[PDB]
Write an enzyme that holds these catalytic residues in place. Structure first.
Site, PDB file in Angstrom:
ATOM      1  CG  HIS A  88      -1.803  -1.121   1.413  1.00  0.00           C
ATOM      2  ND1 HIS A  88      -2.926  -1.302   0.634  1.00  0.00           N
ATOM      3  CD2 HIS A  88      -1.774  -2.163   2.277  1.00  0.00           C
ATOM      4  CE1 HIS A  88      -3.551  -2.402   1.013  1.00  0.00           C
ATOM      5  NE2 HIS A  88      -2.873  -2.943   2.009  1.00  0.00           N
ATOM      6  CG  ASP A  91      -2.228  10.573  -4.800  1.00  0.00           C
ATOM      7  OD1 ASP A  91      -1.779  11.707  -4.530  1.00  0.00           O
ATOM      8  OD2 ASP A  91      -2.951  10.364  -5.799  1.00  0.00           O
ATOM      9  CG  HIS A  93      -6.118  14.269  -4.805  1.00  0.00           C
ATOM     10  ND1 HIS A  93      -7.401  14.131  -5.289  1.00  0.00           N
ATOM     11  CD2 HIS A  93      -5.430  13.190  -5.255  1.00  0.00           C
ATOM     12  CE1 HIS A  93      -7.487  13.020  -5.999  1.00  0.00           C
ATOM     13  NE2 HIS A  93      -6.305  12.431  -5.994  1.00  0.00           N
ATOM     14  CG  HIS A 128      -6.690   7.957  -3.775  1.00  0.00           C
ATOM     15  ND1 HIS A 128      -5.940   7.151  -4.605  1.00  0.00           N
ATOM     16  CD2 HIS A 128      -6.822   9.140  -4.420  1.00  0.00           C
ATOM     17  CE1 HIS A 128      -5.631   7.819  -5.703  1.00  0.00           C
ATOM     18  NE2 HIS A 128      -6.155   9.029  -5.615  1.00  0.00           N
ATOM     19  CB  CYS A 129      -4.323   3.134  -1.258  1.00  0.00           C
ATOM     20  SG  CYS A 129      -3.020   1.918  -1.472  1.00  0.00           S
ATOM     21  CG  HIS A 138      -5.199  -1.098  -3.363  1.00  0.00           C
ATOM     22  ND1 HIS A 138      -4.315  -1.236  -2.314  1.00  0.00           N
ATOM     23  CD2 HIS A 138      -4.981  -2.157  -4.179  1.00  0.00           C
ATOM     24  CE1 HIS A 138      -3.595  -2.331  -2.487  1.00  0.00           C
ATOM     25  NE2 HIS A 138      -3.979  -2.908  -3.611  1.00  0.00           N
ATOM     26  CG  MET A 143      -6.506   2.166   1.411  1.00  0.00           C
ATOM     27  SD  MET A 143      -5.388   0.764   1.293  1.00  0.00           S
ATOM     28  CE  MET A 143      -4.044   1.344   2.355  1.00  0.00           C
ATOM     29  CG  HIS A 248     -30.544  17.885  -2.177  1.00  0.00           C
ATOM     30  ND1 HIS A 248     -30.898  18.914  -3.023  1.00  0.00           N
ATOM     31  CD2 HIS A 248     -31.517  17.819  -1.238  1.00  0.00           C
ATOM     32  CE1 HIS A 248     -32.032  19.451  -2.609  1.00  0.00           C
ATOM     33  NE2 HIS A 248     -32.428  18.805  -1.526  1.00  0.00           N
ATOM     34  CD  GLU A 272     -32.026  22.820  -7.056  1.00  0.00           C
ATOM     35  OE1 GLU A 272     -33.080  22.205  -6.783  1.00  0.00           O
ATOM     36  OE2 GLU A 272     -31.922  23.559  -8.059  1.00  0.00           O
ATOM     37  CB  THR A 273     -28.300  19.524  -5.992  1.00  0.00           C
ATOM     38  OG1 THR A 273     -29.572  19.183  -5.421  1.00  0.00           O
ATOM     39  CG2 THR A 273     -27.485  18.256  -6.214  1.00  0.00           C
ATOM     40  CG  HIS A 299     -31.121  15.018  -5.479  1.00  0.00           C
ATOM     41  ND1 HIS A 299     -32.032  14.632  -6.440  1.00  0.00           N
ATOM     42  CD2 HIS A 299     -31.846  15.587  -4.484  1.00  0.00           C
ATOM     43  CE1 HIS A 299     -33.252  14.954  -6.046  1.00  0.00           C
ATOM     44  NE2 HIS A 299     -33.167  15.535  -4.862  1.00  0.00           N
TER      45      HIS A 299
HETATM   46 CU   LIG Z   1      -3.971   0.069  -0.564  1.00  0.00          CU
HETATM   47 CU   LIG Z   2     -34.890  16.365  -3.913  1.00  0.00          CU
HETATM   48 CU   LIG Z   3      -6.028  10.657  -6.990  1.00  0.00          CU
END
Ligand SMILES: [Cu+2]
Ligand SMILES: [Cu+2]
Ligand SMILES: [Cu+2]
Ligand SMILES: [Cu+2]
Ligand SMILES: [Cu+2]
Ligand SMILES: [Cu+2]
Lengths: 328, 332, 328
Positions: A88, A91, A93, A128-129, A138, A143, A248, A272-273, A299
């Protein structure tokens, strides 16, 4: 130079809760220390008992939310116990360089590694892995998590004014692809390795069998329903490391929303969303004004009410008949 | 309405190049408006789209998937001579999302094999736009066969940041993302055809599943990797134009960010800052500006990791320069 | 207090048309009274005569567009005739509290209810039925519409200057999941409830069989095409209550677009295509500059030209040679 910066240790908290922190930084930059232990474990994801071989950061899906301030240094000690079976890494971001840290944190069972990177950009980010050749496997095994890099002076509205939340929740949305036998039933596996073949096949259909919050259908309901009170300001960090989602708040809105979660951008108002692209973390700020039960969902109502992407808010306080009322 | 005399405008011819590369141009316009002349030749051709050797009957603009990136400035006039040689078998045309009227030009550019036509339109809106073939009744078939590209209409004064300050890139790349729906047989094997037509029925069926068999950059899996990896150097400012004419995508530079991003790619709008990932809607072109700060290998992908690492939506960046231990480092 | 406000009764009109209203408010806050009758009915959705058991608001798909101004109180009388067989209710994304009103508007056949809520946020919002445990089924059966809450001083551009439309159209995009059989043909049912199981199975594939504007394939084409004239300013409200869409005017643009539809935010300019997330309503303003036929579509060209998400505009006026022409 880094040697002069004082250090602080953080005790992570299991989602949907978030470890305490100051919104407005009270000091100059710091080296924040975090520690997570990778844990491969079986996990029940729906009400029918379907279980999978989950790959987690600190034993949960999603992994815990890490919180620091812009320009602090994040120093993570990543542990991969010999009780696990796979390689494993992680990473970020939020980090710059070496595939977000993936190429510097590869650890086989029995190994650990410490990565440090400067949090140069404010906002919520996904982590994330990402093992070479088995990335989606993964990630879709759960993960992934998120890290929030708050502006040193806290959050601000579309006019530079302060936005202070009373509480914060982290909702990690997970898309699962449980392999099914020729009969249409979920197949069983002894190890993550034996399932690979079927896993790849299931993922390539691009059709999740489950889409859940905090690891399982109904995970954020009942005794685990999120809570709030009329007048309370709540920030909800929402991430999806592999697939788009559209959060939402049923009965409410996202008063201030950073759909793609980067704070140097003014938030969108009265949503709203909103759309949080796969591989992104977003944040929504809302001030509750009505008590009662609310449903927080992806939603695409099928993904929400059929596949599992739905949770609840139980809000205390006085009902406001001016805002809404049943006319008799 | 009083006519505008176009004959007075100077004209300049452009020699298009194959993606991800971009033809010569100036960010900050060195002249006033011009009638920019382009010529593209439609080419139906077989194309291998994956490492297993899967071959499809591609429909292209100038022989490549995606078609080449065209670059002009705001208020120039785009004049495209579209040629459909008699060696082809189908009807084609072109729709510029950058143009106003006649379905983007589609209603004025229908050409059968052996025919040609010249279209001219004023690039009144700055931004990166998608252009694609769109024959009535067979639109998605032509587009998902690879017949789409992009055109960039630069502001006459170059790109600017959220504060109205200049953003100058040292290099630019055009990444065209393509979703393919290769039909398979009852057994699960990709079927084969001698003519583009004969496969229509199957194509329609494969498309209606809305489930791509391949999602690739520059026409095929690994097209932008290995010896064909994109390159940069620490300190270099790079603009990456990314288009998807039929389906949503979510670009992400693994190890980097989108310092300044026009997700829906229209320059009259300020860019979004520090994007980790952004959404480019199907039928749209977006642009991301980034300044590399670390050397090494980077992966540029569609962040639905399945689409990226299983279906093919992944490319590489090989960056030279000195490693910065302050930004990131492994602790002993 | 609310008793001192003027009350006005609105007569709703069938989509894509919209009831008469003023953009810049002509008066202060008012109680705008609406009435809608729920209607379960069969509907032919494609040129092949495929019919479904639609669940509608006022007999149409989508339900009609309701228009009020920011801070008005919406007062809706929702009627469920005893000729219907299911329980229904309504959730307004524009409202605050009780699940958008769903928790207060539950009505069995033979019942009716009146809900009032203050439209505190400006923008276009989705409204849809949401019976507990049967949300997506009702929504994807066509039971959704939209409500526009105009700013009191009308629409504004990115510079805060007035934007006035000459006409407005409401395009409701509907994703349908018609169950098939062994042979792969659409199955028919005597009652809507009879097909619940097949519907669930069909929805869970997350793959629509149809994606249409105004209830059916070609609904907005031919003699039902939308119209405009060169020089005309047109606002197109577009909603999708359950799935993402990416509107595009072929031959034109979205001069001013509120992709996620909230007016306190400045519009995005010169959009070729924009993303309206499922569970959201968006609005695009455009000034036609060329006559002729235009196609308005969901730009996933498969969903538009194969599944049905495409409409037409027939525009009058003189052609502009400077903007475009076919050369010698
Ligand atoms: Cu992993
Ligand atoms: Cu709705
Ligand atoms: Cu990524
Ligand atoms: Cu073509
Ligand atoms: Cu198009
Ligand atoms: Cu209903």
């Amino acid at each position: 130079d880094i040697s002069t910066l004082p250090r602080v240790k953080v005790d992570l908290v299991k989602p949907p809760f978030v470890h305490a922190h100051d919104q407005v930084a009270k000091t100059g930059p710091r080296v924040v220390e975090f520690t997570m232990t990778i844990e491969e474990k079986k996990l029940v994801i729906d009400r029918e008992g379907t279980e999978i071989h989950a790959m987690t950061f600190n034993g949960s899906v999603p992994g815990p939310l890490m919180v620091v301030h812009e320009n602090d240094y994040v120093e993570l000690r990543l542990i991969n116990p010999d009780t696990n079976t796979l390689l494993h890494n992680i990473d970020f971001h939020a980090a710059t360089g070496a595939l977000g840290g993936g190429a510097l944190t590869q650890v086989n069972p029995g190994e650990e590694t410490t990565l440090r990177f400067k949090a140069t950009k404010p906002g919520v980010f996904v982590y994330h892995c990402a093992p070479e050749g088995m990335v989606p496997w993964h990630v879709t095994s759960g993960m992934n998590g998120a890290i929030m890099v708050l502006p040193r002076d806290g959050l601000k509205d579309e006019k530079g004014q302060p936005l202070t939340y009373d509480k914060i929740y982290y909702v990690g949305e997970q898309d699962f692809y449980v392999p099914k036998d020729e009969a249409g039933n979920y197949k069983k596996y002894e190890t993550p390795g034996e399932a690979y073949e079927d896993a790849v096949k299931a993922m390539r259909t691009l059709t999740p069998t489950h889409i859940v919050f905090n690891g399982a259908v109904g995970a954020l309901t009942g005794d685990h329903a999120l809570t709030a009170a009329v007048g309370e300001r709540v920030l909800v960090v929402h991430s999806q490391a592999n697939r788009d989602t559209r959060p939402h708040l049923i009965g409410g809105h996202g008063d201030y929303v950073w759909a793609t979660g980067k704070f140097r951008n003014p938030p969108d108002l009265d949503q709203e969303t909103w759309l949080i692209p796969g591989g992104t973390a977003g944040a929504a700020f809302y001030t509750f004004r009505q008590p009662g039960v609310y449903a927080y969902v992806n939603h695409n109502l099928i993904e929400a009410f059929e596949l599992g992407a739905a949770g609840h808010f139980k809000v205390t306080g006085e009902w406001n008949d001016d805002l809404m009322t049943s006319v008799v």
